Enzyme design. Structure first.
Site, mmCIF file in Angstrom:
data_model
loop_
_atom_site.group_PDB
_atom_site.id
_atom_site.type_symbol
_atom_site.label_atom_id
_atom_site.label_comp_id
_atom_site.label_asym_id
_atom_site.label_seq_id
_atom_site.Cartn_x
_atom_site.Cartn_y
_atom_site.Cartn_z
ATOM 1 N N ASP A 3 -40.846 -15.594 -17.629
ATOM 2 C CA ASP A 3 -40.006 -15.630 -16.441
ATOM 3 C C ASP A 3 -40.529 -16.706 -15.495
ATOM 4 O OD1 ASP A 3 -38.631 -14.569 -13.838
ATOM 5 O OD2 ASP A 3 -37.912 -13.149 -15.371
ATOM 6 N N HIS A 13 -34.503 -8.818 -15.586
ATOM 7 C CA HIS A 13 -35.411 -9.823 -16.114
ATOM 8 C C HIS A 13 -35.786 -9.610 -17.574
ATOM 9 C CE1 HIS A 13 -36.277 -11.840 -12.245
ATOM 10 N NE2 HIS A 13 -35.835 -10.687 -11.785
HETATM 11 O O1 LIG Z 1 -24.982 0.746 -15.816
HETATM 12 C C1 LIG Z 1 -25.536 -0.300 -16.039
HETATM 13 C C2 LIG Z 1 -25.678 -1.202 -15.025
HETATM 14 C C3 LIG Z 1 -26.320 -2.390 -15.284
HETATM 15 N N1 LIG Z 1 -26.774 -2.641 -16.486
HETATM 16 C C4 LIG Z 1 -27.446 -3.868 -16.767
HETATM 17 O O2 LIG Z 1 -28.299 -4.168 -15.711
HETATM 18 C C5 LIG Z 1 -28.505 -5.558 -15.638
HETATM 19 C C6 LIG Z 1 -28.538 -5.896 -14.176
HETATM 20 O O3 LIG Z 1 -28.825 -7.231 -13.920
HETATM 21 P P1 LIG Z 1 -28.158 -7.904 -12.717
HETATM 22 O O4 LIG Z 1 -28.523 -9.283 -12.687
HETATM 23 O O5 LIG Z 1 -26.784 -7.534 -12.743
HETATM 24 O O6 LIG Z 1 -28.732 -7.343 -11.371
HETATM 25 P P2 LIG Z 1 -29.976 -6.532 -10.855
HETATM 26 O O7 LIG Z 1 -29.693 -6.424 -9.466
HETATM 27 O O8 LIG Z 1 -30.169 -5.283 -11.539
HETATM 28 O O9 LIG Z 1 -31.184 -7.491 -10.971
HETATM 29 C C7 LIG Z 1 -30.962 -8.891 -11.107
HETATM 30 O O10 LIG Z 1 -30.394 -9.453 -9.924
HETATM 31 C C8 LIG Z 1 -29.831 -10.746 -10.172
HETATM 32 C C9 LIG Z 1 -30.581 -11.540 -11.213
HETATM 33 O O11 LIG Z 1 -30.547 -12.857 -10.770
HETATM 34 C C10 LIG Z 1 -32.027 -11.182 -11.164
HETATM 35 O O12 LIG Z 1 -32.685 -11.952 -12.139
HETATM 36 C C11 LIG Z 1 -32.227 -9.684 -11.325
HETATM 37 O O13 LIG Z 1 -33.065 -9.289 -10.253
HETATM 38 C C12 LIG Z 1 -27.326 -6.160 -16.347
HETATM 39 O O14 LIG Z 1 -27.816 -6.905 -17.446
HETATM 40 C C13 LIG Z 1 -26.474 -4.997 -16.782
HETATM 41 O O15 LIG Z 1 -25.909 -5.119 -18.069
HETATM 42 C C14 LIG Z 1 -26.595 -1.708 -17.496
HETATM 43 O O16 LIG Z 1 -27.017 -1.907 -18.622
HETATM 44 N N2 LIG Z 1 -26.000 -0.575 -17.242
#
Ligand SMILES: O=c1ccn([C@@H]2O[C@H](COP(=O)(O)OP(=O)(O)O[C@H]3OC[C@@H](O)[C@H](O)[C@H]3O)[C@@H](O)[C@H]2O)c(=O)[nH]1
EC number: 2.4.1.-
Length: 448
Positions: A113, A14
């Site tokens: 948000d 987020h």
């Molecule tokens: O090793 C990593 C892994 C992940 N990340 C970052 O972490 C973020 C993760 O966001 P994601 O949306 O992939 O997923 P998350 O599960 O962590 O949370 C998200 O779920 C889906 C979205 O719709 C939600 O808004 C949010 O809850 C990404 O922007 C990714 O670039 C890193 O920087 N390094």
């Protein structure tokens, strides 16, 4: 001179989209103030050009959040807690900031948000326009507004109604399997999903982290359900979320990627919140080994239930083409030429990041919006394959191979490469994303 105040939900998926938006808006000439809880705060020393104001989370800590923990499925209870009790603090803090503004400066609007649905009646009380930032896809929002029909067709009853799991009703994209996964824990979701939808409909504008050609089927719903203007901006095409990380980057990974042949490495990462039962985690491991391709796998500590990082992983059970790290700058990795595929948990940021880097994907999901992101990208766009029957090494190893090596998956790789070009074309003058950003900036300038 105009200031924008932005208020993220303090979780990685987020603040990432919302601080990318703030950098973009700062590039168009706005002053930025970010309102944040102390909990899960970003490294504010990475944002010298932003003003940071910490709220609702401070130090004589209220008892509803005083003992709330910092890990696991549970820290998210601050979202309902803050929605139901934070209005008065948010209003003083917005009042204080407006009161303290120089007079050549004006607060053009608040961007929150969508989950902060309480912010709408706060901003109204101050005659401040609020805009919403949507962190998931137009497609899942079409599922959210489709929910009254889903519940009445017997779809969100996980117990008494089962076993009709294929082509769904007024929604031929998905199988019933995917709707039950999306709304499994049902009436926690519906109050926030209810009030969130009700107050983004009431907002002054909705910013979507997406681009028109990515979800063109879904545009008409958003236009018809939300009276507020909508703007589709693909934030990963503008900048990485790197400097809003909440874990430290490994970045040793790049010396090792520099030693792989092009498109030979599978990137694996299941988000920032997911956890898996150790039995499952060793089946994922063996699928990677059986695949025979090189992998770089991010296992965030806590991922594994219950262990503190990978203690169930044997000899180097992995190694000689596999690498495990705690955390990477994800989009920078997806952009390195060694990466040929991305095994994701279908979180919307990761999915969009991979789309914007031209990397085809393998999809797993852990619920919520994820199984519909997975079905949408894998069956409509067809930029990856979807492992929809759980963890099995064989089926894992064939998915990896079909996306990465099999001739049969070449159309999936070509689709990924083309989808990327569509994202870059949308950014050029006369493209869908370019015109949305120009409209959004001129819109925010008129609220002032
Ligand atoms: O090793 C990593 C892994 C992940 N990340 C970052 O972490 C973020 C993760 O966001 P994601 O949306 O992939 O997923 P998350 O599960 O962590 O949370 C998200 O779920 C889906 C979205 O719709 C939600 O808004 C949010 O809850 C990404 O922007 C990714 O670039 C890193 O920087 N390094």
């Amino acid at each position: 001179r105009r200031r924008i105040i932005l208020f993220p939900v303090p979780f990685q998926g987020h603040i990432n989209p919302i601080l990318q938006l703030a950098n973009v808006l700062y590039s168009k000439g706005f002053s930025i103030t970010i309102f944040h809880t102390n909990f899960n705060k970003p490294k504010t020393s990475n944002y010298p050009h932003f003003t940071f104001r910490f709220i609702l989370d401070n130090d004589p800590q209220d008892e509803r959040i005083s003992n709330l923990p910092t890990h696991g499925p549970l820290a998210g209870m601050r979202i309902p807690i803050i929605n139901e009790h934070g209005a008065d603090e948010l209003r003083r803090e917005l009042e204080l900031l407006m009161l303290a503004s120089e007079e050549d400066e004006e607060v053009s609007c608040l961007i929150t948000d969508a989950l902060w649905y309480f912010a709408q009646s706060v901003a109204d009380s101050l005659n401040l326009r609020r805009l919403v930032l949507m962190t998931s896809s137009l497609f899942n929002f079409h599922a959210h507004v489709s929910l009254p029909q889903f519940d009445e067709l017997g779809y969100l009853d996980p117990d008494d109604k089962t076993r009709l799991e294929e082509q769904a009703s007024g929604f031929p994209m998905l199988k019933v399997k995917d709707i039950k996964s999306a709304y499994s824990n049902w009436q926690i979701l519906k109050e926030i999903l209810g009030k969130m939808i009700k107050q983004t409909k009431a907002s002054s504008g909705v910013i979507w982290n997406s681009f028109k050609e990515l979800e063109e089927s879904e545009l008409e719903t958003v236009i018809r359900e939300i009276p507020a203007p909508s703007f589709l901006i693909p934030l990963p095409k503008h900048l990485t979320a790197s400097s809003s990380s909440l874990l430290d980057h490994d970045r040793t990974v790049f010396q090792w990627l520099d030693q792989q042949p092009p498109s030979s490495v599978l990137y694996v990462s299941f988000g920032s919140t997911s956890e898996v039962d150790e039995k499952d985690f060793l089946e994922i491991a063996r699928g990677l080994v059986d695949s025979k391709q090189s992998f770089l796998w991010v296992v965030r500590p806590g991922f594994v239930k219950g262990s503190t990082w990978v203690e169930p992983l044997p000899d180097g059970f992995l190694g000689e083409r596999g690498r495990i790290v705690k955390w990477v700058p994800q989009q920078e990795v997806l952009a390195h030429g060694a990466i040929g595929a991305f095994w994701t948990h279908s979180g919307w940021n990761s999915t969009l990041e991979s789309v914007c880097e031209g990397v085809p994907m393998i999809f797993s999901d852990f619920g919520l919006d994820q199984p519909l992101n997975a079905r949408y990208m894998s069956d409509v766009l067809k930029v990856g394959v979807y492992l929809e029957n759980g963890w099995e090494r064989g089926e894992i190893a064939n998915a990896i191979r079909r996306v990465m090596v099999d001739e049969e998956g070449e159309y999936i790789r070509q689709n990924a490469r083309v989808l990327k070009q569509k994202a870059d074309v949308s950014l050029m003058k006369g493209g869908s994303s370019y015109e949305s950003l120009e409209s959004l900036v001129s819109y925010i300038s008129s609220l002032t």
